Design a protein around this nucleic acid. Structure first.
Ligand SMILES: [K+]
Ligand SMILES: [Mg+2]
Ligand SMILES: [Mg+2]
Ligand SMILES: [Mg+2]
Ligand SMILES: [Mg+2]
Ligand SMILES: [Mg+2]
Ligand SMILES: [Mg+2]
Ligand SMILES: [Mg+2]
Ligand SMILES: [Mg+2]
Ligand SMILES: [Mg+2]
Ligand SMILES: [Mg+2]
Ligand SMILES: [Mg+2]
Ligand SMILES: [Mg+2]
Ligand SMILES: [Mg+2]
Ligand SMILES: [Mg+2]
Ligand SMILES: [Mg+2]
Ligand SMILES: [Mg+2]
Ligand SMILES: [Mg+2]
Ligand SMILES: [Mg+2]
Ligand SMILES: [Mg+2]
Ligand SMILES: [Mg+2]
Ligand SMILES: [Mg+2]
Ligand SMILES: [Mg+2]
Ligand SMILES: [Mg+2]
Ligand SMILES: [Mg+2]
Ligand SMILES: [Mg+2]
Ligand SMILES: [Mg+2]
Ligand SMILES: [Mg+2]
Ligand SMILES: [Mg+2]
Ligand SMILES: [Mg+2]
Ligand SMILES: [Mg+2]
Ligand SMILES: [Mg+2]
Ligand SMILES: [Mg+2]
Ligand SMILES: [Mg+2]
Ligand SMILES: [Mg+2]
Ligand SMILES: [Mg+2]
Ligand SMILES: [Mg+2]
Ligand SMILES: [Mg+2]
Ligand SMILES: [Mg+2]
Ligand SMILES: [Mg+2]
Ligand SMILES: [Mg+2]
Ligand SMILES: [Mg+2]
Ligand SMILES: [Mg+2]
Ligand SMILES: [Mg+2]
Ligand SMILES: [Mg+2]
Ligand SMILES: [Mg+2]
Ligand SMILES: [Mg+2]
Ligand SMILES: [Mg+2]
Ligand SMILES: [Mg+2]
Ligand SMILES: [Mg+2]
Ligand SMILES: [Mg+2]
Ligand SMILES: [Mg+2]
Ligand SMILES: [Mg+2]
Ligand SMILES: [Mg+2]
Ligand SMILES: [Mg+2]
Ligand SMILES: [Mg+2]
Ligand SMILES: [Mg+2]
Ligand SMILES: [Mg+2]
Ligand SMILES: [Mg+2]
Ligand SMILES: [Mg+2]
Ligand SMILES: [Mg+2]
Ligand SMILES: [Mg+2]
Ligand SMILES: [Mg+2]
Ligand SMILES: [Mg+2]
Ligand SMILES: [Mg+2]
Ligand SMILES: [Mg+2]
Ligand SMILES: [Mg+2]
Ligand SMILES: [Mg+2]
Ligand SMILES: [Mg+2]
Ligand SMILES: [Mg+2]
Ligand SMILES: [Mg+2]
Ligand SMILES: [Mg+2]
Ligand SMILES: [Mg+2]
Ligand SMILES: [Mg+2]
Ligand SMILES: [Mg+2]
Ligand SMILES: [Mg+2]
Ligand SMILES: [Mg+2]
Ligand SMILES: [Mg+2]
Ligand SMILES: [Mg+2]
Ligand SMILES: [Mg+2]
Ligand SMILES: [Mg+2]
Ligand SMILES: [Mg+2]
Ligand SMILES: [Mg+2]
Ligand SMILES: [Mg+2]
Ligand SMILES: [Mg+2]
Ligand SMILES: [Mg+2]
Ligand SMILES: [Mg+2]
Ligand SMILES: [Mg+2]
Ligand SMILES: [Mg+2]
Ligand SMILES: [Mg+2]
Ligand SMILES: [Mg+2]
Ligand SMILES: [Mg+2]
Ligand SMILES: [Mg+2]
Ligand SMILES: [Mg+2]
Ligand SMILES: [Mg+2]
Ligand SMILES: [Mg+2]
Ligand SMILES: [Mg+2]
Ligand SMILES: [Mg+2]
Ligand SMILES: [Mg+2]
Ligand SMILES: [Mg+2]
Ligand SMILES: [Mg+2]
Ligand SMILES: [Mg+2]
Ligand SMILES: [Mg+2]
Ligand SMILES: [Mg+2]
Ligand SMILES: [Mg+2]
Ligand SMILES: [Mg+2]
Ligand SMILES: [Mg+2]
Ligand SMILES: [Mg+2]
Ligand SMILES: [Mg+2]
Ligand SMILES: [Mg+2]
Ligand SMILES: [Mg+2]
Ligand SMILES: [Mg+2]
Ligand SMILES: [Mg+2]
Ligand SMILES: [Mg+2]
Ligand SMILES: [Mg+2]
Ligand SMILES: [Mg+2]
Ligand SMILES: [Mg+2]
Ligand SMILES: [Mg+2]
Ligand SMILES: [Mg+2]
Ligand SMILES: [Mg+2]
Ligand SMILES: [Mg+2]
Ligand SMILES: [Mg+2]
Ligand SMILES: [Mg+2]
Ligand SMILES: [Mg+2]
Ligand SMILES: [Mg+2]
Ligand SMILES: [Mg+2]
Ligand SMILES: [Mg+2]
Ligand SMILES: [Mg+2]
Ligand SMILES: [Mg+2]
Ligand SMILES: [Mg+2]
Ligand SMILES: [Mg+2]
Ligand SMILES: [Mg+2]
Ligand SMILES: [Mg+2]
Ligand SMILES: [Mg+2]
Ligand SMILES: [Mg+2]
Ligand SMILES: [Mg+2]
Ligand SMILES: [Mg+2]
Ligand SMILES: [Mg+2]
Ligand SMILES: [Mg+2]
Ligand SMILES: [Mg+2]
Ligand SMILES: [Mg+2]
Ligand SMILES: [Mg+2]
Ligand SMILES: [Mg+2]
Ligand SMILES: [Mg+2]
Ligand SMILES: [Mg+2]
Ligand SMILES: [Mg+2]
Ligand SMILES: [Mg+2]
Ligand SMILES: [Mg+2]
Ligand SMILES: [Mg+2]
Ligand SMILES: [Mg+2]
Ligand SMILES: [Mg+2]
Ligand SMILES: [Mg+2]
Ligand SMILES: [Mg+2]
Ligand SMILES: [Mg+2]
Ligand SMILES: [Mg+2]
Ligand SMILES: [Mg+2]
Ligand SMILES: [Mg+2]
Ligand SMILES: [Mg+2]
Ligand SMILES: [Mg+2]
Ligand SMILES: [Mg+2]
Ligand SMILES: [Mg+2]
Ligand SMILES: [Mg+2]
Ligand SMILES: [Mg+2]
Ligand SMILES: [Mg+2]
Ligand SMILES: [Mg+2]
Ligand SMILES: [Mg+2]
Ligand SMILES: [Mg+2]
Ligand SMILES: [Mg+2]
Ligand SMILES: [Mg+2]
Ligand SMILES: [Mg+2]
Ligand SMILES: [Mg+2]
Ligand SMILES: [Mg+2]
Ligand SMILES: [Mg+2]
Ligand SMILES: [Mg+2]
Ligand SMILES: [Mg+2]
Ligand SMILES: [Mg+2]
Ligand SMILES: [Mg+2]
Ligand SMILES: [Mg+2]
Ligand SMILES: [Mg+2]
Ligand SMILES: [Mg+2]
Ligand SMILES: [Mg+2]
Ligand SMILES: [Mg+2]
Ligand SMILES: [Mg+2]
Ligand SMILES: [Mg+2]
Ligand SMILES: [Mg+2]
Ligand SMILES: [Mg+2]
Ligand SMILES: [Mg+2]
Ligand SMILES: [Mg+2]
Ligand SMILES: [Mg+2]
Ligand SMILES: [Mg+2]
Ligand SMILES: [Mg+2]
Ligand SMILES: [Mg+2]
Ligand SMILES: [Mg+2]
Ligand SMILES: [Mg+2]
Ligand SMILES: [Mg+2]
Ligand SMILES: [Mg+2]
Ligand SMILES: [Mg+2]
Ligand SMILES: [Mg+2]
Ligand SMILES: [Mg+2]
Ligand SMILES: [Mg+2]
Ligand SMILES: [Mg+2]
Ligand SMILES: [Mg+2]
Ligand SMILES: [Mg+2]
Ligand SMILES: [Mg+2]
Ligand SMILES: [Mg+2]
Ligand SMILES: [Mg+2]
Ligand SMILES: [Mg+2]
Ligand SMILES: [Mg+2]
Ligand SMILES: [Mg+2]
Ligand SMILES: [Mg+2]
Ligand SMILES: [Mg+2]
Ligand SMILES: [Mg+2]
Ligand SMILES: [Mg+2]
Ligand SMILES: [Mg+2]
Ligand SMILES: [Mg+2]
Ligand SMILES: [Mg+2]
Ligand SMILES: [Mg+2]
Ligand SMILES: [Mg+2]
Ligand SMILES: [Mg+2]
Ligand SMILES: [Mg+2]
Ligand SMILES: [Mg+2]
Ligand SMILES: [Mg+2]
Ligand SMILES: [Mg+2]
Ligand SMILES: [Mg+2]
Ligand SMILES: [Mg+2]
Ligand SMILES: [Mg+2]
Ligand SMILES: [Mg+2]
Ligand SMILES: [Mg+2]
Ligand SMILES: [Mg+2]
Ligand SMILES: [Mg+2]
Ligand SMILES: [Mg+2]
Ligand SMILES: [Mg+2]
Ligand SMILES: [Mg+2]
Ligand SMILES: [Mg+2]
Ligand SMILES: [Mg+2]
Ligand SMILES: [Mg+2]
Ligand SMILES: [Mg+2]
Ligand SMILES: [Mg+2]
Ligand SMILES: [Mg+2]
Ligand SMILES: [Mg+2]
Ligand SMILES: [Mg+2]
Ligand SMILES: [Mg+2]
Ligand SMILES: [Mg+2]
Ligand SMILES: [Mg+2]
Ligand SMILES: [Mg+2]
Ligand SMILES: [Mg+2]
Ligand SMILES: [Mg+2]
Ligand SMILES: [Mg+2]
Ligand SMILES: [Mg+2]
Ligand SMILES: [Mg+2]
Ligand SMILES: [Mg+2]
Ligand SMILES: [Mg+2]
Ligand SMILES: [Mg+2]
Ligand SMILES: [Mg+2]
Ligand SMILES: [Mg+2]
Ligand SMILES: [Mg+2]
Ligand SMILES: [Mg+2]
Ligand SMILES: [Mg+2]
Ligand SMILES: [Mg+2]
Ligand SMILES: [Mg+2]
Ligand SMILES: [Mg+2]
Lengths: 7, 48, 275
RNA sequence: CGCGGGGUGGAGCAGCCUGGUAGCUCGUCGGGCUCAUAACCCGAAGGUCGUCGGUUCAAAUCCGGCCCCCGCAACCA
RNA sequence: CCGAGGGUAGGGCCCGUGACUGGGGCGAAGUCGUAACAAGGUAGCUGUACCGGAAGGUGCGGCUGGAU
RNA sequence: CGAUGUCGGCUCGUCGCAUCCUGGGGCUGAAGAAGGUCCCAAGGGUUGGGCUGUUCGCCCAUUAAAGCGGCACGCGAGCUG
RNA sequence: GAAUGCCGGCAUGAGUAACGAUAAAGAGGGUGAGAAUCCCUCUCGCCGUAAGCCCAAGGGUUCCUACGCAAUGGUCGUCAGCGUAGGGUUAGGCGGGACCUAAGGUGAAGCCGAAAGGCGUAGCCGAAGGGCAGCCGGUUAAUAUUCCGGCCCUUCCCGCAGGUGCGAUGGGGGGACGCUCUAGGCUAGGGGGACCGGAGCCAUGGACGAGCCCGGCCAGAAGCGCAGGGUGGGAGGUAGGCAAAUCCGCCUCCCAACAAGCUCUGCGUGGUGGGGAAGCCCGGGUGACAACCCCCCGAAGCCAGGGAGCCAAGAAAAGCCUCUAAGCACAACCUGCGGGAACCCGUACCGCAAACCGACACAGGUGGGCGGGUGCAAGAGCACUCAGGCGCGCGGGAGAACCCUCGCCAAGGAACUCUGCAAGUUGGCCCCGUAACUUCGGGAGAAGGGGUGCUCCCUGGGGUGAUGAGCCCCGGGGAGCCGCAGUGAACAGGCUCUGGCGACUGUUUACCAAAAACACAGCUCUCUGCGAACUCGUAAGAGGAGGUAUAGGGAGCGACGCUUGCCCGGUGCCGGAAGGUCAAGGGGAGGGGUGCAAGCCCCGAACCGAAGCCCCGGUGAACGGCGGCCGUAACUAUAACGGUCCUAAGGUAGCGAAAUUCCUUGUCGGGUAAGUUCCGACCUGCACGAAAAGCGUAACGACCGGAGCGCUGUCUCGGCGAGGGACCCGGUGAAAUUGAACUGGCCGUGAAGAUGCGGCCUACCCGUGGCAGGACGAAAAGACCCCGUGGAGCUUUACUGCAGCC
RNA sequence: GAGCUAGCCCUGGCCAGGGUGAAGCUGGGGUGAGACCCAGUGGAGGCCCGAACCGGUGGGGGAUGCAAACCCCUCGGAUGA
RNA sequence: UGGUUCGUGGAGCCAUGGGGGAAUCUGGGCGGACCACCGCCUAAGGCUAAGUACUCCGGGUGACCGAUAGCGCACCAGUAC
């Protein structure tokens, strides 16, 4: 599961 | 699915066997170490 | 006379095959074949040392007579011309009046039923082997030994030849298939005529699978790789070379000369190759 | 008030660095050649150097402010 | 059953029209050069080919409808 | 920063009023009809589509009207991606 | 007392989720302390190219039987792959070894390496490849090609007889080979029979019948028959097959040659030996003296080392046959016959799975053979069924929301949405018919349409047989009948127009990317004369290649079409016996230390002195790069034209708001009621452009864009219905999380978002089914960001080394 | 450690059925001879449709799973690299 | 080049991969570049107890542990897994 990206 | 362990008696004996170990400087050190540690089995069991 | 096909598949549109017209015997001489051990380009370490090799059709090696000074003076009849998968040339089966049989590379124009002979006194006819000194200047020749008694080394591929340009001392001057001008010792044997099957170079493989049949695995460009792999590897998007074009091992590959400088054979090479 | 370069006869460019000197090509003006125009030949005129202020005995030139004209940058989110 | 015709679908020919585009004709006094007519100042013309703001230039071969 | 998931949409609402409509008004350069402007008023209502991820906006067809803002740019242990 | 500390114990969540494919169960009888769950019987359902049967791996007693049920079994348990005990695996012919060799491994000779060790021809090892002698039936609770029975066969030893120049690890032959297609004749297997054998049956309206139902074979030596495979015979010469050779090879001659002859298989027959159903009665008995026969279909199997065609050109060695050498010809070998001899290991059971690989009795993974019948054009597809095997090791009710999988839907028909995502539609076969474009193959199943069942009658060809009948395979014509509907169920394309990209079939990030990426034929440059270049290795030795410039390495580009312009000043590479610089070394002008001196010792200029660098040239499908300002035409505008500065040279053709355009939804045109997307144009191209190729291109694509038709529950806009869950009762019973808790709302306050502080409001105690706003809810010591004189991968004209090369 | 995975080497095995109909061959036409055209025969192909087998396109489910990558529907290849 | 305290240092000594290459006591090496003087020692063959190190094994002894300690193991442990 791709981690959430706060980028 | 296809897992990694796919047993094969001939493969086992020719790869980890007593005679494979003895043929080689590192393999003899394996035997030397497992004797010093007191292993009941110096080499993997395979029925042949 | 390379053969074409009608475009009934996308690959048959371009494929061409050799016409096999000169061939007169479709199975080899059992006593003259032996197994050709395929390598896949791997050396005695098991390491790939020539990339992209393997997986081609199984072949039997045909023993070829590259000496012919072996049987001086003994004539032979040309029994057949056969396909050989181990080389581009066709090959000729010889029946010596001895009863001995042998294969040679089939020169252009050689005819089934004619005779051939080797030696210092042989006539100057297509298919005959003489020492180089006894062959007249101007003669087109193939299967040339490069040193006496060491075996034919030069001009062996389909269609090739050398031409005798002149003499000097114990040596004759040859123009090799590459155009190089070279001194070859006069006692070196050579065979009169050019190698045959000269249409070989016009075959169009036509499809990727054909290269696979020949044992040629796909070749991948350095520019398609990563910096771990290759000087041309990496870059965002496509990328030019960005440095002098190089091999996988980093040496330059556009012009950089590679013949060893102090090689003894330089005293015997008159003029480097042409075109 | 992110960064850089530029402004000097009519046009396009030197001179600045290294203070005291304004230069080159074309254009323009007078004359000549030709029936005549152009080309060509012989002469000449025209720039106080974007502006202000300072330094200096002296500023196109060195330093600062302003005006204008280009060019570059603006990423991680 | 055939059957005017209606419907569905796919073709053929012709006309009109279309952002834009190609060249053509014509138009008293526009800009550039001067290719041709004199050996027109490199004889011209010519089929082809390549090139050039433009007429044109050059290569190859051909013609005299070229002069001296 | 030993983690407060970050745009838009969908769903579901709820609130403020600087009010888009409907209701009540004063002034008008309000004849009538229709407007303009300001005051009171938040009870209810405030459409369907083309384009774009879009918020917004432009356009089509309507409408009494096609309001503007807050709720972690409301709402991912509710969905979407 | 804290370290997301360590080890152990025990809580919470909670009687909660779950109990592992939605193939499915019901009853009667029995056993037992106890039974939905074990046994038996009837009924029902599921698989049936398997979910049945047989091998090989792997597993290792799980096999069979008696006794058991604490634990294991997701419930239960009397049952079990579980516990205890006893029993069980039988070979000259099956498989492997006392036979052969393959890759590869090992390795006398030999080569190399500080040591360890690395190589290496022969030879040896190495098999699911070669070679080699057993078929059918019976028997056990459990093994059987193994025991037994019947009929066959192999090697070794010895002997007798006959024959022969006998004799080998040496010579030779043979063994011995691909892919696709395929002939004849057979077998396996299957269908039908009004014929043969059989316990019986007549029901509920009819049938005592050419009725129904069941079965109608298997193995076999010599001999014979059919069909195939393999093979020329004789003589003369002979210098080749590393000795010899009567063999083999070559040459010559004569004969035999779509033959024959000899030889070897397959199939049939065959003395004989077996088997033998339904049904009924109790695995057995009976049937039964069972019958065992005709017709058809027919292999991918057999004859086989068969035939043809093609290019990519298709193992070895032994067995075997032949030749001869030492030798020996009292021997020896060949043939026949007789007697004797014949060892070791495996054999149980599971084996697409509860016994193997996945921690589990796990919806996953696991190679080879058999795999029946009917219909559907065919088939291993699909539906139903045989043999055989199962109902998936928790159940009983209920008939809420909600979820999953499924069915239908009025009117509308993409209005849904990023997107027709999803789901409809279409759907097989036969006939009719079919566009642009095109590389002439194709595009094409283009599109679009018609037919499709059953009955009677006439009739065509092919196979079998006989040339007939019967059987069998493809049809053709006419007349009818029925329904809403005839590929009536199941399996089975939605279509079109138009752009971008990539020519194409292929390949890829095992497990978030399948693509426009990689590869690809093809094009070009460049290196390489062979002990090649290049690659791996300290080396020896290998690969390259048993190849040789039409070949091999490296690099870019990427079918094909039309093309690929200008710059060589910088970097690269290539060429250049001059010159400049240049290390060790040579040289030794000239000094110095010390010694009484002979001397010993040290420093040292000119000059000679490689590669490299400088220098001079060449070179672009080498790295790369391809301009600015100002002015000018008789309307305006715009500039073909001119001026000047600069450059190594100033972007040619083609293309262009683009997979590239910032301003931008550029502007105009098309399509739409309306179009930031799309398509066609324009060109002030922020920032295309010619092998990091430019512009096109038929065909191709689970790629990405835009449109239309068809059709729809996508939507207006939801409704109903099915089953598996959810819910209730009986059985078994987790989890992350958790400082403790007696845990409300508002308005404030507080480290700035309060159940916990203030003030006020509200509120009896405790659950069950639900929803997710909050507990800055769980999970993971933020993967973004910074910081650390932290780490790692990668680059280069950063530094400094090293290999390698000069 | 290559019993997973990647490549190569050796030796074996597997790919139902249907469709399209290249070359060649034969014959006919054609010509001075030809090229060539027509028909029949033929059975080619990184050809077509589709099981096994090999894949993993789109969606849904699953997410303390049946499963540390599975299931359903759909979809690619299927004589070949 | 290594060794030594000696990292090129005035760098000797001891060892030696490369080149060159003697002499037999009036021969040769050393005393930290080198020279003289003065001294020390006899290279290019080999052997040699004891005093020294260790603890698999045996014993003796602890202001050593006392079953989460002490060895990983007090127990059928280098076992189960
Ligand atoms: K970042
Ligand atoms: Mg795998
Ligand atoms: Mg698999
Ligand atoms: Mg395996
Ligand atoms: Mg094995
Ligand atoms: Mg095995
Ligand atoms: Mg193995
Ligand atoms: Mg090994
Ligand atoms: Mg071994
Ligand atoms: Mg050792
Ligand atoms: Mg033991
Ligand atoms: Mg071991
Ligand atoms: Mg072709
Ligand atoms: Mg063609
Ligand atoms: Mg040929
Ligand atoms: Mg051989
Ligand atoms: Mg080797
Ligand atoms: Mg290579
Ligand atoms: Mg290779
Ligand atoms: Mg070759
Ligand atoms: Mg050949
Ligand atoms: Mg020579
Ligand atoms: Mg080629
Ligand atoms: Mg090949
Ligand atoms: Mg290639
Ligand atoms: Mg490539
Ligand atoms: Mg790359
Ligand atoms: Mg890459
Ligand atoms: Mg690597
Ligand atoms: Mg690199
Ligand atoms: Mg690069
Ligand atoms: Mg790249
Ligand atoms: Mg780029
Ligand atoms: Mg890349
Ligand atoms: Mg690019
Ligand atoms: Mg490039
Ligand atoms: Mg570059
Ligand atoms: Mg380079
Ligand atoms: Mg030589
Ligand atoms: Mg050369
Ligand atoms: Mg400031
Ligand atoms: Mg200056
Ligand atoms: Mg000055
Ligand atoms: Mg001036
Ligand atoms: Mg001045
Ligand atoms: Mg930046
Ligand atoms: Mg009508
Ligand atoms: Mg002219
Ligand atoms: Mg003129
Ligand atoms: Mg002129
Ligand atoms: Mg002229
Ligand atoms: Mg010119
Ligand atoms: Mg934070
Ligand atoms: Mg935490
Ligand atoms: Mg957290
Ligand atoms: Mg919606
Ligand atoms: Mg209101
Ligand atoms: Mg919008
Ligand atoms: Mg916003
Ligand atoms: Mg907007
Ligand atoms: Mg109104
Ligand atoms: Mg708002
Ligand atoms: Mg905000
Ligand atoms: Mg914001
Ligand atoms: Mg939100
Ligand atoms: Mg979410
Ligand atoms: Mg959201
Ligand atoms: Mg949340
Ligand atoms: Mg929530
Ligand atoms: Mg939350
Ligand atoms: Mg504390
Ligand atoms: Mg914890
Ligand atoms: Mg800790
Ligand atoms: Mg702990
Ligand atoms: Mg305990
Ligand atoms: Mg614990
Ligand atoms: Mg506990
Ligand atoms: Mg408690
Ligand atoms: Mg509890
Ligand atoms: Mg709960
Ligand atoms: Mg659960
Ligand atoms: Mg569960
Ligand atoms: Mg299922
Ligand atoms: Mg029951
Ligand atoms: Mg029970
Ligand atoms: Mg019970
Ligand atoms: Mg039972
Ligand atoms: Mg019953
Ligand atoms: Mg096991
Ligand atoms: Mg029990
Ligand atoms: Mg007990
Ligand atoms: Mg249990
Ligand atoms: Mg279980
Ligand atoms: Mg009991
Ligand atoms: Mg048993
Ligand atoms: Mg037996
Ligand atoms: Mg024996
Ligand atoms: Mg070694
Ligand atoms: Mg072995
Ligand atoms: Mg074998
Ligand atoms: Mg056997
Ligand atoms: Mg038998
Ligand atoms: Mg039997
Ligand atoms: Mg052969
Ligand atoms: Mg062979
Ligand atoms: Mg074989
Ligand atoms: Mg082939
Ligand atoms: Mg039979
Ligand atoms: Mg049948
Ligand atoms: Mg002879
Ligand atoms: Mg001779
Ligand atoms: Mg046979
Ligand atoms: Mg019986
Ligand atoms: Mg009886
Ligand atoms: Mg088969
Ligand atoms: Mg066969
Ligand atoms: Mg061999
Ligand atoms: Mg005798
Ligand atoms: Mg005999
Ligand atoms: Mg024995
Ligand atoms: Mg045994
Ligand atoms: Mg057995
Ligand atoms: Mg399976
Ligand atoms: Mg199987
Ligand atoms: Mg089982
Ligand atoms: Mg595991
Ligand atoms: Mg189970
Ligand atoms: Mg399973
Ligand atoms: Mg049957
Ligand atoms: Mg069918
Ligand atoms: Mg069940
Ligand atoms: Mg099942
Ligand atoms: Mg209920
Ligand atoms: Mg289901
Ligand atoms: Mg249903
Ligand atoms: Mg209905
Ligand atoms: Mg409806
Ligand atoms: Mg519609
Ligand atoms: Mg409609
Ligand atoms: Mg999408
Ligand atoms: Mg259908
Ligand atoms: Mg069309
Ligand atoms: Mg057409
Ligand atoms: Mg079209
Ligand atoms: Mg087209
Ligand atoms: Mg066509
Ligand atoms: Mg009909
Ligand atoms: Mg009917
Ligand atoms: Mg289809
Ligand atoms: Mg592609
Ligand atoms: Mg691609
Ligand atoms: Mg392309
Ligand atoms: Mg293309
Ligand atoms: Mg394919
Ligand atoms: Mg992936
Ligand atoms: Mg990945
Ligand atoms: Mg992974
Ligand atoms: Mg993983
Ligand atoms: Mg995926
Ligand atoms: Mg991708
Ligand atoms: Mg794909
Ligand atoms: Mg890729
Ligand atoms: Mg391609
Ligand atoms: Mg070494
Ligand atoms: Mg090789
Ligand atoms: Mg070789
Ligand atoms: Mg190309
Ligand atoms: Mg490519
Ligand atoms: Mg391509
Ligand atoms: Mg074209
Ligand atoms: Mg250059
Ligand atoms: Mg140059
Ligand atoms: Mg250059
Ligand atoms: Mg030099
Ligand atoms: Mg550059
Ligand atoms: Mg440059
Ligand atoms: Mg140009
Ligand atoms: Mg051009
Ligand atoms: Mg544009
Ligand atoms: Mg536009
Ligand atoms: Mg474009
Ligand atoms: Mg651009
Ligand atoms: Mg734009
Ligand atoms: Mg934009
Ligand atoms: Mg617009
Ligand atoms: Mg429009
Ligand atoms: Mg524009
Ligand atoms: Mg195209
Ligand atoms: Mg196309
Ligand atoms: Mg594709
Ligand atoms: Mg695709
Ligand atoms: Mg559409
Ligand atoms: Mg719905
Ligand atoms: Mg229900
Ligand atoms: Mg109750
Ligand atoms: Mg309970
Ligand atoms: Mg339990
Ligand atoms: Mg408390
Ligand atoms: Mg409390
Ligand atoms: Mg509470
Ligand atoms: Mg409360
Ligand atoms: Mg504060
Ligand atoms: Mg605050
Ligand atoms: Mg508060
Ligand atoms: Mg409270
Ligand atoms: Mg408190
Ligand atoms: Mg309190
Ligand atoms: Mg307080
Ligand atoms: Mg309080
Ligand atoms: Mg309070
Ligand atoms: Mg309250
Ligand atoms: Mg509750
Ligand atoms: Mg409850
Ligand atoms: Mg609840
Ligand atoms: Mg909540
Ligand atoms: Mg919350
Ligand atoms: Mg928190
Ligand atoms: Mg929260
Ligand atoms: Mg996580
Ligand atoms: Mg940490
Ligand atoms: Mg942190
Ligand atoms: Mg972290
Ligand atoms: Mg930061
Ligand atoms: Mg630092
Ligand atoms: Mg620091
Ligand atoms: Mg650091
Ligand atoms: Mg690092
Ligand atoms: Mg090199
Ligand atoms: Mg493997
Ligand atoms: Mg293996
Ligand atoms: Mg296939
Ligand atoms: Mg045909
Ligand atoms: Mg033909
Ligand atoms: Mg033929
Ligand atoms: Mg295909
Ligand atoms: Mg098809
Ligand atoms: Mg779907
Ligand atoms: Mg998962
Ligand atoms: Mg699945
Ligand atoms: Mg499916
Ligand atoms: Mg197929
Ligand atoms: Mg297919
Ligand atoms: Mg094939
Ligand atoms: Mg030292
Ligand atoms: Mg020293
Ligand atoms: Mg030395
Ligand atoms: Mg002395
Ligand atoms: Mg002396
Ligand atoms: Mg000494
Ligand atoms: Mg001393
Ligand atoms: Mg001394
Ligand atoms: Mg001494
Ligand atoms: Mg002593
Ligand atoms: Mg004590
Ligand atoms: Mg104590
Ligand atoms: Mg204890
Ligand atoms: Mg303790
Ligand atoms: Mg101990
Ligand atoms: Mg312990
Ligand atoms: Mg312990
Ligand atoms: Mg134990």
């Amino acid at each position: 599961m791709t981690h959430s990206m706060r980028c | 699915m296809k897992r990694t362990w796919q047993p094969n008696r001939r493969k086992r004996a020719k790869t980890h066997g007593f005679r494979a170990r003895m043929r080689t400087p590192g393999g003899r050190k394996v035997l030397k170490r497992r004797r010093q540690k007191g292993r009941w089995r110096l080499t993997p069991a395979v029925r042949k | 006379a390379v053969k074409k096909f009608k475009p009934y598949t996308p690959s048959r549109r371009f494929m061409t095959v050799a016409d096999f017209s000169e061939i007169t015997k479709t199975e080899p001489e059992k006593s003259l074949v032996k197994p050709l051990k395929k390598t896949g380009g791997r050396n005695n370490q098991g390491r790939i040392t020539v990339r992209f090799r393997g997986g081609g059709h199984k072949r039997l090696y045909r023993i070829i007579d590259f000496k012919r000074w072996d049987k001086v003076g003994i004539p032979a009849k040309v029994a057949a011309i056969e396909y050989d998968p181990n080389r581009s040339a066709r090959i000729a089966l010889l029946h010596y009046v001895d009863g001995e049989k042998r294969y040679i590379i089939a020169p252009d124009g050689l005819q089934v039923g004619q005779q051939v002979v080797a030696g210092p006194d042989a006539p100057i006819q297509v298919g005959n082997a003489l020492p180089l000194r006894f062959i007249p200047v101007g003669t087109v020749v193939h299967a040339v030994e490069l040193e006496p008694k060491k075996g034919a080394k030069l001009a062996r591929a389909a269609g090739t030849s050398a031409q005798i340009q002149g003499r000097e001392g114990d040596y004759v001057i040859l123009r090799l298939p590459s155009g190089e001008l070279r001194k070859v010792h006069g006692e070196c044997y050579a065979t009169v005529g050019a190698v045959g099957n000269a249409d070989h170079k016009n075959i169009v493989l036509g499809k990727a699978g054909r290269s696979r049949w020949l044992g040629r695995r796909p070749h991948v460009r350095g520019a398609a790789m990563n910096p771990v792999d290759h000087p041309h590897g990496g870059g965002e998007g496509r990328a030019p070379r960005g440095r002098p074009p190089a091999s996988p091992w980093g040496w330059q590959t556009k012009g950089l000369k590679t013949r060893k400088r102090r090689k003894p054979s330089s005293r015997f090479i008159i003029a480097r190759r042409k075109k």
